[PDB]
Write a protein that binds this DNA or RNA. Structure first.
Ligand SMILES: [Zn+2]
Ligand SMILES: [Zn+2]
Ligand SMILES: [Zn+2]
Ligand SMILES: [Zn+2]
Lengths: 199, 199, 199, 199
DNA sequence: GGGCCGCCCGGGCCGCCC
DNA sequence: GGGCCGCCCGGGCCGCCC
């Protein structure tokens, strides 16, 4: 079987969708999402709010998993990992393994997983329904390397795959978005959107 | 009996066909398929996505085998192997014999076979139906020598033969395409397509 | 005492001087020395010939040590080391510690030392007089990181300090030159020489 | 000490010089020497006559050694060897190790040596004075790879170093010349001589 | 917010076929 | 002897300094 997780959108029985904040485009804004590109632009280690929307509430014990894969076919097989420089940096929260690219901040029940067959990394939190009167549940992700990091992503674009799963790991829903971790998310979003409109 | 495997197209009971991505034509693109030539142009060791399409799902235990043979009659008899230089290069994935031209990346159940009678190499993975909502199953192949390699293919064109087989080795379907492994797949595809249109 | 080794030129009793080949200026030449800047421009891991000239022959047991220090006052204190990415690369010659920036190739008696007090790296070979009829002795050095390497030199210029020492470590002579390890030594030498002439 | 043998010309006590036949420049002549370049152009495995001239006769037991080194500083450290393809070719004379680039044909007392410290290859024959009435002693060398061989010389020019030595290995004399092993020695000699006269 | 170094890019330069 | 594929080449395109 393939060692590359599927990226196919699957809203599933609960109508699972992702939402992103309306952020702006100042040159070095910490995080900003492009709907035209379905692509998040963000700085290293900064908060990236991701909204979980459902049409109906999934059962208790539902989990939310985030995992990165390289976007290009030529690189899908390679596990996405932190580069050796940032791996050795003293910046662990005491829970996230230093090799993991994606973290979750502000959650008491975070789990960091290494797949036993594919060796891919992922980070898991329990699914929580929105507060009564709220439309969605917001998770704060962090990406611990720039897309450009030498010896790590090395300028290769990645996708983040968000899955809703039961406690057994069965797929309840799946969505994805592209990520660029860079120094100037506002400049780069504008550049990439202009290259899109030009072509 | 002939030691040269058949290349005859056979869609079979399950309507087996191959598909290829719409790739582009930049001078040194890593992989690009020419429908006019039914020919894949790719760089050494780079990802070559090949799509498996069926009209109906073959049974569990079905296998997908890929094998290379020289295209020209004068060379069909000779086993396709890596050249001595690349055979000795430390580029093994720990599974593929260093002599094998064709590898599969990103699959946990890959097998590398040497025919006991013909000594030809092949690489096998289990057939997997596409995800629900997907049209095909994609396999990532790698070719570990240039077509031009001295002491190996030595500028002789090859065919890749893809067979659908049951677990006993019975034939369920067969397709094939020409392969050129080269430094500049975009240049060489254009050159060969132009020579086709001129002739 | 200072943990920063002196860079002061000292020709000493034997008239110790350095010489460099007349190299050229093509964009990506592997190594080229600028007399205007007393600066070597070279590519990662490529041969850097350095000539040892003396007015008279030092005694047997003389050693030639090479050590790097950061040029700028702000960085002199920090030990010059390879970055984490290149430290983990499998490029060791079986002798050079993976942390050492400077190597010597083609010498059977090379030693790699870590100072017990300052922890600075250096590489040592025996001094050999030139062949009869030759004017100098040539050593081939290699620099195993780019000056720009993240987590290593990180765009900070270095000096290479070459010392002539007796077997006890007493100083017999000392010379030095600036080094930039970069992808395009010819481009960068021209750029820096033009900035010199303009200023 | 350096693992790179000296190439310095040393006529020595016996006035040791090399001579080469006047050959011509037909496109694919098997061997032709350029005095303007001090460079031999020859085809793979073909006879390359090399003349040994002395002003006076060296003692009995004198040996003649030929050894190849790469000409460019960047490659001097690497041992010159046959490529993996020609190494596996069944073309040994029963004496020459398949890895050795340089052979001697037509000599009953040929020795093939692998240096115990540098691992460099060489081929040795006894020195013989010319016949009475003859001016020189001619040795027939063969080069068993093209300069272009992938995984071997890989288009890097080499020097052949010819040394006169006593039975102990002491240096009595040394000369050298560049070698290009190629398919068309006449064409390539003319090309390289024209590039010389142009510049 | 303006603007200043590794790597990608298309042009074009040696064994073998004719 | 004429002439037809991997690799070298100079132009030019993302973190950090200002
Ligand atoms: Zn990083
Ligand atoms: Zn090969
Ligand atoms: Zn480095
Ligand atoms: Zn060869």
């Amino acid at each position: 079987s393939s060692s590359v997780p599927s990226q196919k959108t699957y809203q599933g029985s609960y109508g699972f969708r992702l939402g992103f904040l309306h952020s702006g485009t100042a040159k070095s804004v910490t995080c900003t999402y492009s709907p035209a590109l379905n692509k998040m632009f963000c700085q290293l280690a900064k908060t990236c709010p991701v909204q979980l929307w459902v049409d109906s509430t999934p059962p208790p014990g539902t989990r939310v998993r985030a995992m990165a894969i390289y976007k290009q076919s030529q690189h899908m097989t390679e596990v996405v990992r932190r580069c050796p420089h940032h791996e050795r940096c003293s910046d662990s929260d005491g829970l996230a393994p230093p090799q993991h690219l994606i973290r979750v901040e502000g959650n008491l029940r975070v789990e960091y997983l290494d797949d036993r067959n594919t060796f891919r990394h992922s980070v898991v939190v329990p699914y929580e329904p929105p507060e009564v009167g709220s439309d969605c549940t917001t998770i704060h992700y962090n990406y611990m390397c720039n897309s450009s990091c030498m010896g790590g992503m090395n300028r290769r674009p990645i996708l983040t795959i968000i899955t809703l799963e039961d406690s057994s790991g069965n797929l309840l829903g799946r969505n994805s978005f592209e990520v660029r971790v860079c120094a100037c998310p506002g400049r780069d979003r504008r550049t990439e959107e202009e290259n899109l409109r030009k072509k």
